[PDB]
Design a protein around this ligand. Structure first.
Ligand SMILES: Cc1ccc(N)cc1-c1ccccc1Cl
Ligand SMILES: [Ca+2]
Ligand SMILES: [Cl-]
Length: 371
């Protein structure tokens, strides 16, 4: 099981696609909800995601059918299409997924943030870094729900530097475009969701605390954090979860005025990556870095909760640390940082010690020696 949120709010969930094209925004929304008696949210909602996952794992596309057999009815504890909790303006997190992932695979993070009173827009990227994504070729196709699927792109070695950078740049644009979409919904723009879902978007009118915006992301999504902050000053801080720094252009590093928090796994990180993170540092800038002891790269994604301990450890979905313990550290440390740099009037400063890596399962800064 994907854990329930630790915060006081019930969590709702819905999907938003606007416009219907491959250039439109596609996101999964997690939000504080009025009600707590809806059906739980389907974790991976289409067979094509499973096909995409098996291609990303380098297996038979028919191995995707076995993943579907095992995981196709799995849910995540958010109230599907629940009404938005009224009477409050909510801070906004835009969240960017990693390579081979898609919008639904970071619900442990999205639900926990929502249960503490955030709206979370988890974008689905159309840069061919998702395992799979979909869109509609035109208005006709959208009406009848005739989906066009777009699958992960594999690269030749000679394509690596250039294409990863084009993708992180599109990823940042998709984050800004998702922000503009939510901000226009907040400020009352009528939006026809390309998906026929029983959640009226008119609920989001006057529901965003418009100054309190952050960008969060894992791996390729952590590079997306940094690119996004450098090009869109509407985002006031960013949290990079085990960022994979390779996609970033050399120009970006001296161009991040916003506060930036690195939360790293112990076993993923390496000198070339840490060096790149340290290039984001300068004395006028707010930077923080922590490492979770005993953790692996996948500790930030929902796959860490999808299997048992032995199979978990074998597939590198779990580390030596307990998955609930690790995500609690990452989510609590993130809440304290967001309180500090967004100016929230909550009680998230109870976790200020974690921003400093002060906990028996935290390393201050990094374990990686770059000297
Ligand atoms: C089995 C597996 C191995 C590696 C990664 N990264 C993900 C998976 C996976 C895919 C779909 C559903 C559940 C899981 Cl655990
Ligand atoms: Ca911009
Ligand atoms: Cl790892």
């Amino acid at each position: 099981k994907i854990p329930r949120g630790n915060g006081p709010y019930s969590v709702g969930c819905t999907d938003l696609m606007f416009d219907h094209t491959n250039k439109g925004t596609f996101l999964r929304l997690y939000y504080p909800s009025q009600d707590n008696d809806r059906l739980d949210t389907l974790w991976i909602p289409n067979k094509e995601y499973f096909w995409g996952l098996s291609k990303f794992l380098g297996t038979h596309w028919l191995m995707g059918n076995i993943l579907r057999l095992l995981f196709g009815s799995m849910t995540t504890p958010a109230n599907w299409n629940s009404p938005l909790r009224p009477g409050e303006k909510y801070p906004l997190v835009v969240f960017s997924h990693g390579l081979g992932a898609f919008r639904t695979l970071y619900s442990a993070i999205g639900i926990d943030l929502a249960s503490h009173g955030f709206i979370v827009a988890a974008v689905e990227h159309r840069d061919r870094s998702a395992s799979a994504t979909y869109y509609f070729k035109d208005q006709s196709a959208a009406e009848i729900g005739d989906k066009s699927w777009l699958y992960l792109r594999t690269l030749k070695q000679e394509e690596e530097t250039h294409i990863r950078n084009e993708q992180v740049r599109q990823r940042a644009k998709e984050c800004s475009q998702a922000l503009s979409l939510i901000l226009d919904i907040d400020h009352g723009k009528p939006v026809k969701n390309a998906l026929d879902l029983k959640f009226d978007m008119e609920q989001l009118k006057d529901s965003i605390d418009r100054e309190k915006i952050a960008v969060i992301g894992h791996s390729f999504g952590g590079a997306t954090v940094i690119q996004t902050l450098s090009e869109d000053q509407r985002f006031r801080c960013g949290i990079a979860l085990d960022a994979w720094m390779f996609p970033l252009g050399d120009e970006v590093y001296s161009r991040i005025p916003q506060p930036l928090f690195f939360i790293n796994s112990e076993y993923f990180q390496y000198p070339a990556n840490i060096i790149k993170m340290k290039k984001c540092y300068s004395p006028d800038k707010e930077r923080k870095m922590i490492t979770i002891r005993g953790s692996v790269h996948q500790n930030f994604a929902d796959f860490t909760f999808a299997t048992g301990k032995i199979i978990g450890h074998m597939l590198k979905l779990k580390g030596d640390i307990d998955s609930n313990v690790a995500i609690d550290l990452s989510n609590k440390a993130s809440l304290a940082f967001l309180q500090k740099h967004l100016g929230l009037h909550k009680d998230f400063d109870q976790w200020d010690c974690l921003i400093e890596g002060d906990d028996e399962n935290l390393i201050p800064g990094t374990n990686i020696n770059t000297t």
